[model samples]
Target: GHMRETIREIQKVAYWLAIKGLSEANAGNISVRLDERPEGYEVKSVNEYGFDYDGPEMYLLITATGSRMREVYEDDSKICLLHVLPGKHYEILHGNGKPTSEFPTHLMIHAKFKEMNPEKKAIVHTHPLNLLTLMNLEEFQELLPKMMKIHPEVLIFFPQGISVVEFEKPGSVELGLKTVEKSEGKDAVLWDKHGVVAFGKDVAEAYDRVEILEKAAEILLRVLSLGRNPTG
Candidate 1:
C-alpha cells in the first residue's frame, strides 16, 4: 500500500503510452526516484561498476525489461525497484524480471538531474511515431528551435529545448554517458535513430513534455507534407 499512488501513476502513464501508439511491445521504459524507502530495506547489487554516489542515497522504481507497458497492471512483475549502491552500480530490491538494460542510462540521467537540481524525479523513455518521423527529416537541434517558433507551447513548456544524441548501441554505457552529456541543462533528449527520453519533477510533468514534443513534430510534419513551411 506504500506504493499505491506510485503504482497508479506508472500504470496510468504506461496505458497512455500504449493507447497513443508510442510504446510498441516493450519498447519504452519508465523510472522514478523514490522520496523515501520502505522499512527494513536492504540493498543488493546485481552488477558493480565505477561510478560513485556521493549524494544522499536514492531509490528508483523502474519498469522491467521485456514488459509491455499496456499489460503492466495485469502483470505486476513488469515493475521493479532499484537501490542505488555507493558506487555507480545498483542492486535490484524488488520485481520478478530483470531491470531494463537501459538502467545505466536512467541512473546517469537521474544523477545529472540531481547534480543540477534536487527536484528532478521521474523519467519517461518512449518512441512516439510523429516525433520519430520528424527525426528522420530534422535533427533534434534544428527541429526543436523551429517547432518552438511554430508552436509557442514548445517554448513555453521546454524553454531550453530538447537535447539529442547520435545513434549508439542502445543500453550501452556509451550511449548513456552521451545522453547525460547532451542533456546537461535540458529536461529531454532525443535518441537519434532510437527514441526520446524525458525527465521532470514527476511522471505527469515528464509525460506532458514528451506529449508537447510529439504534437509539435506532428504539426510540423503535416505542414511540410502540404508543401508549406512553418515560419515564425
Candidate 2:
C-alpha cells in the first residue's frame, strides 16, 4: 500500500512475471503484505483499489484464479483477496467455482510461515518444471539443497536451503497438510512431483527467486548430464 496502483501497474507486474517464465497458464500466485502490519501479526485493511484484507494484511493479487488463465490472454484474471486464519479457518473472495485446488497447501504454507517466522511477508507458489524435475530425480537428492551452497545463483537467492515435500497427489488433503508442515522455516519448497513454491518480502524478490532457482536447476541438470561434479 506504499504506492498507488492502477490496472497498468498490475499489468506490468503480470507481464514481466509472465515473460520471465515465472508463471504459465494459471500456475502461480502472488501476494504482498501491506507493509503496515506489525511483525508476527496479521493485519487487515481495505486498499484504495477496494480490495479488503482481514488475515495478515494480505492480498491475493493473481492466484487461485488468474493463474488458471496465465499463458493465455493477458488482461483477464480472477484475482481477489481471501482471509485465511491460522490453524483454523479461512474466508474466500471472488469464489467463482471453487478455490484453487492448491488452496489448502497455500494456506498451510502461509500459516506455518507466519507462525514460525513472523517477519516473512509475501508468499509465491509456482510450478517450475525444471526445479520440480530436479526434485523428483533420486540422483539429485544430495545435490539439491547443496546446490544453493555451491552455486552462486542458488547461494545468493535460495538461502533458506529449499524445502522438499513428499510428492502427494495434487489438490489432496495430503498435499495441503504436508505443505503446512514442510514450509516451516523454509523459504521455498520443491514439491515432490508437483512444482516449486517460494516466498519473500515482496513480489519482485519472490518472483526473482523462482526464476533464479529454476535456472539453477536447469544448469544443474546440464552439469549432471555431462557427468561433471556440480559441487566442484
Candidate 3:
C-alpha cells in the first residue's frame, strides 16, 4: 500500500531530521495507515515474544515516552496498524503521542480533518523551532508570505501560512479541539513551543512536510541572527 511505502520513506527522512537536530528528544511522532491489514500473527510460543513467520506490516506509532525517532514496532508487528482502521474512530497507537490519554483530542483532529479533506490519509506532528517561535507572536498567524520560503516546493496556503495551536497538554481534548479551531480549512498547525503538527495524504508526505518546516525554521533562525530580514 502507498501508506506502507510512505511510512518507509518517512522513516528515512525522520532519522535524517533527528541526526540534524530538527526533532528534540521525544519531541516528534509519525504514523502511517497500513494499506493492507496483515493477517493475524501466529503465536510462536506461550511466552510474550511471539514470532510471526509471515511478512506483516509493522505499523509504527510514536509516543512522548519513547525517545524521539524511536521505532515503536518491529517487523511483522501490527502494533501500529490496529488503531488505524476504517471502522474504529480512534485506537491507542502503541508508539508515541499517546492519543488515548488525550484520545478525544487526537481523534478530534483526525476526525475533523478526515471530514474536511478526503485526500488526507495520515498525519505527522513534531517540534520544530522556527514555526513554534513564530506562534508566540501575534501578527504572524497569517504567515504564508514567510512560510513559503521555508517550503517553496510544498503547497502553502497564502495568508494563512501554518495554523497555530495554543499551548495544550499532550493529548488533551481541549488541545485537540484547539487544533481543529486553528486548523480550520488549513493543513498544518504549530503547537506553541511544543511542536508542529501537519497532515498529509500519506505518511511519507506528512513527514516530508515536517522536514521542510525544520529547514525553514533553521533558515529563519539564521536570518534573524544575521540582523537581516529573512523575507528578502
Alpha-carbon lDDT of model 1: 0.77
Which candidate tops TM-score?
1
lDDT of 3: 0.54
* Tens-digit lDDT track of model 2 for 120-198: 6666666777786777676767787556655677776655577777775765556756865766666677776767777
Q: Best candidate per lDDT, number? A: 1
TM-score of each: 0.87, 0.71, 0.66
RMSD (Å) per prediction: 2.8, 6.5, 7.6
Model 3 misplacement above 4 A? 1-10, 33-38, 41-67, 71-79, 84-104, 132-151, 154-160, 230-232
In model 3, where is the ten-residue run with the lowest total lDDT? Answer: 47-56
* True-vs-predicted CA distance for residue 188, candidate 2, Å: 0.8
Cα TM-score of candidate 3: 0.66
Going through the candidates in order, what is the number of backbone clashes in each?
2, 7, 8
Cα lDDT tens digits for candidate 3, 89-180: 33443323332233334555665565566566566777666666755556564443565555565455323457656685776656877888
- CA lDDT of each prediction against the hidden true structure: 0.77, 0.57, 0.54
